[PDB]
Ligand SMILES: [Zn+2]
């Protein structure tokens with residue numbers, strides 16, 4: 200029998216860690232990359248294809264799921280795992296970020312009321328409502344509901360949102376604990392806030408550790424600050440969180456962002472980049488991203504990446520993917536997307552192996568030299 | 576205003592002719608190749624794609640259409656042109672060949688009763704019933720109903736089927752003439768029979784010319800006799816038919832069959848070969864057919880054929896079509912099929928142009944030397 204949630208660290212190198220999260224629906228290898236999940240339709244990669252890229256867990260966007268088809272409908276269909284055809288762990292976000300970035304009728308300490316950008320209907324989110332919707336979705340890792348502060352934020356607005364987020368973190372904790380079916384079978388992560396300000400980040404860390412969570416996310420980054428500033432904030436923010444629990448950097452990111460974040464102690468990542476790039480004709484490679492529409496690929500018989508061992512690179516040449524993309528054939532975008540997600544998983548595997556072997560610092564330096572030289 | 580049916584010969588070279596058939600729905604350039612038509616679904620090439628290969632007319636199989644979805648249903652949907660999304664001329668066969676080769680309850684001078692190889696239901700064909708079904712389909716060129724004699728045939732069975740076919744030809748003529756809507760707007764072809772026997776072929780020709788048709792088909796070939804014997808029979812059979820009317824060789828054939836048949840006076844052809852080959856990974860080229868699954872094409876950046884100007888060859892390499900076919904992707908079979916039909920139309924255009932210029936005899940010799948050398 201596997202446990203509800205058990206994080207184990209197998210090896211360390213400086214701030215970097217590798218290990219596993221054991222949950223009832225499966226084992227997650229860390230550092231982990233979560234692809235953003237979709238309904239199982241003909242428009243998206245099949246779930247068996249996503250699993251075969253190496254993904255151990257996928258992410259569901261609560262905001263989009265509550266607009267279409269709705270959380271009650273997903274519960275009636277058997278839950279998010281049945282809906283997505285994915286029987287391994289699923290992490291759901293709280294919905295709060297998309298409320299700021301996509302939807303907004305009322306805002307107060309109680310919660311938020313907002314209008315669907317689809318059909319204008321009114322919806323409500325709060326710590327209690329978010330946790331309940333994530334219960335209806337049946338997700339394995341639940342994110343606490345917080346308040347996002349746009350970039351850039353004044354020190355006053357950053358302090359105010361961080362303090363509200365910590366009161367909302369306690370409310371998410373109590374809501375999660377109130378449902379025995381959820382509390383016995385899922386896990387709950389809290390989210391550190393405080394923008395670029397060290398004292399606010401420390402205030403937030405202390406409040407979260409006092410409440411107590413299964414994992415801790417670093418929020419408020421990857422919203423336009425640039426990598427240098429993001430790394431500077433990670434430098435002091437990650438050591439503030441409890442060492443024996445997973446650290447999750449939400450919405451990051453490009454491959455070099457991930458490598459540097461793992462160097463700073465992050466264990467978990469999610470990003471739409473591999474899928475967005477795949478649909479726009481961009482492939483990630485060890486030599487940097489390439490635009491497959493470029494004429495120089497029209498006669499290039501090599502795979503997208505010379506070392507990738509994804510199913511696409513064992514079979515398909517740059518020239519043929521170039522031909523499919525230039526013709527507008529959906530197969531072209533599917534192959535690009537599969538390779539990009541698999542490339543991210545291969546990046547995580549090399550990170551994990553190099554930490555295990557105590558050579559991650561060298562891997563990161565070798566990785567950057569080659570990725571930025573762009574000898575593709 | 577275009578006429579019901581006007582065949583005009585623009586140029587001759589020996590027995591070969593080139594010209595046009597003008598009909599109400601369009602002009603047919605001769606010698607002509609008719610691809611075998613299908614319902615407009617996602618499984619088959621779109622009708623606009625078939626037209627863009629150069630096809631002026633397509634063939635409908637009466638036997639298959641009367642089994643599914645049935646001729647009355649096709650009439651209710653607006654006729655075969657609406658059903659196939661094809662607004663240019665359509666030739667329909669009589670159904671009689673598929674009765675022998677695919678279905679058979681009763682046979683007599685009256686007609687035939689047979690069982691659907693699909694659902695076992697009973698159907699009836701006769702000169703009168705065939706012409707009526709082809710009227711319900713709304714086709715532009717109607718084939719007379721005859722009796723096929725299997726290969727090889729004894730002289731006695733060949734004489735008996737030929738004589739019945741000529742009595743059935745008269746009955747088809749009278750049935751076609753009995754419907755003003757059909758007789759004013761469509762054309763009727765009779766079919767010469769007589770197997771390999773010169774005296775029976777002459778008997779058949781005389782009977783058909785006495786009845787009088789808009790066009791004359793040479794039946795009973797391409798059923799296993801081999802090309803040498805087929806050419807030998809064409810040598811004496813085609814001159815027996817009226818010179819100022821089109822000559823149609825049913826079910827032929829391979830590119831070299833077509834060239835040699837045009838040398839012997841044939842104006843019209845149909846064959847499932849380009850489509851069957853396309854779905855089985857075989858492409859026709861000026862250097863003979865190629866099997867695109869062969870490993871030697873996996874890195875071959877040239878198009879299927881070096882001189883073909885079809886839409887596929889302007890864009891797609893052998894290597895990429897090889898990759899699609901080996902992966903089982905329907906796009907691969909579609910591209911092969913489009914190229915094969917377009918290659919046949921380009922063969923007909925080169926035949927027409929070379930006859931016009933009085934160099935067809937040399938084209939045929941050059942064609943055979945290169946096609947059979949197979950330097951692909
Ligand atoms: Zn790959």
Ligand SMILES: [Zn+2]
Nearest residue numbers: 883885888914
């Ligand atoms: Zn071609």
